[PDB]
Structure formats: C-alpha cells, structure tokens
Prior knowledge:
Elements: H1 3-15, E1 16-21, E2 24-32, E3 35-39, E4 47-50, E5 53-64, E6 70-78, E7 98-105, E8 113-128, E9 131-139, E10 151-154, E11 157-165, E12 170-174
Antiparallel strand pairs: 1-2, 1-4, 2-3, 3-6, 4-5, 5-6, 7-8, 7-10, 8-9, 9-12, 10-11, 11-12
Family: Belongs to the picornaviruses polyprotein family.
Subunit structure: Interacts with protein 3CD.
Protein name: Genome polyprotein
Amino acid sequence: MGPSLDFALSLLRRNVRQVQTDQGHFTMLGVRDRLAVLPRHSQPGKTIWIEHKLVNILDAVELVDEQGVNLELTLITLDTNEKFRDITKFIPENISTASDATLVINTEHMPSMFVPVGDVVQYGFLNLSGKPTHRTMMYNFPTKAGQCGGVVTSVGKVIGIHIGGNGRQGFCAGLKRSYFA
Ligand SMILES: */C(=C/C(=O)OCC)[C@H](C[C@@H]1CCNC1=O)NC(=O)[C@H](Cc1ccccc1)NC(C)=O
C-alpha cells in the first residue's frame, strides 16, 4: 500500500472517532493526550457518545478570534484512559491551503469514508445558519449533512475540520497548531 492511503487509514484508526451529541452524528478528531476537537454546532454537553461508550467531557472551549468572532471549533478534554496519538506536528503553524485534499469522515452512518474534495483554497468569512465564522476554507465539492467534523487532509498534513456547505461548495474551519498547544 501507498503513502497517502497509509496516512489517512492510520489517522482513522488512531485519531478519528465516531461520535453522537444531542445534535446527532459527528466525526471527532483526537489531537493529543485527552484533547479532541469538534465543530462548535455539535454542542457537546457533559457527556458524549464515542463509538461504543459514553464519555465524560471535563472541559469545553469554543474558539473565538481576537475580534470576538466565532471560529466553529470546540476543544474538548475527555475523561478517558486513552491518550490520543499526538498529531500536532501534522497541523500547520498557520492555516494552510492545499491541493488534491481529502476529507476523512467517520460516523456510525458514514464510517471510514473518503471524499476527494480536491484543491482547498482560502475562503475567509462564511455564513452558516445565520452564524458568521472566521478563518474558514473552501473546496468545490458538494458536501452533505452528516459530514461535519470530517477531517480535511493532504500530503500527511491535517488542515481543517468540515463545518458547513451549500450544495455545491463545502467549507471547513482551518486548523493551526496553536489551538492545541
Ligand atoms: C454538517 C452538520 C450536520 O449534518 O447537521 C445537520 C443539520 C453540515 C454539513 C454541510 C451543510 C449542508 N451540507 C454540508 O455539506 N453543516 C451544517 O449544517 C452547518 C451547521 C452550522 C451551524 C452554525 C454555524 C456553523 C455551521 N450549517 C450549514 C448552513 O452548513
């Protein structure tokens, strides 16, 4: 097997989890230790269902920028025996665009699902459900309900979390390493 599939499959096995909140099914990325990230609108409460188990959330932090604006990312600290494989070195120091990217989804409804969203480009401000969110990126792929939380990836780098869409173009919250320091 080749390198790009190896990485995505490995990411799946060790870092990308099937979850459900009161808002339904999402894909969750475990970044390191007990720290994972979910899209903000998933609204994790005190517990979250992670694959086969309800897990207690010790702390949740919804990220905003310096101009108070939403970023559509919640950092969660889990009460779990598991440390996540630390993949913060695969996350760029600053939000980065990419080419021939792949969106990696993992929910009970869409398990181990690979979506070739193609080139990923800067995008900026986005309106999702009359909520405005900064630091955003775009792929011209018609993304779908249930794909939120899905992991935007290319060339062994981890660059975004799917948050939103319109029938023609899908959009992610860009990742940067400082969020997980
Ligand atoms: C992912 C969440 C989901 O399945 O929720 C069920 C409603 C979707 C995926 C996107 C949108 C539709 N097609 C796609 O590929 N995202 C959203 O529903 C997203 C939710 C949201 C709310 C508030 C702030 C940011 C994002 N909203 C939109 C309009 O996409």
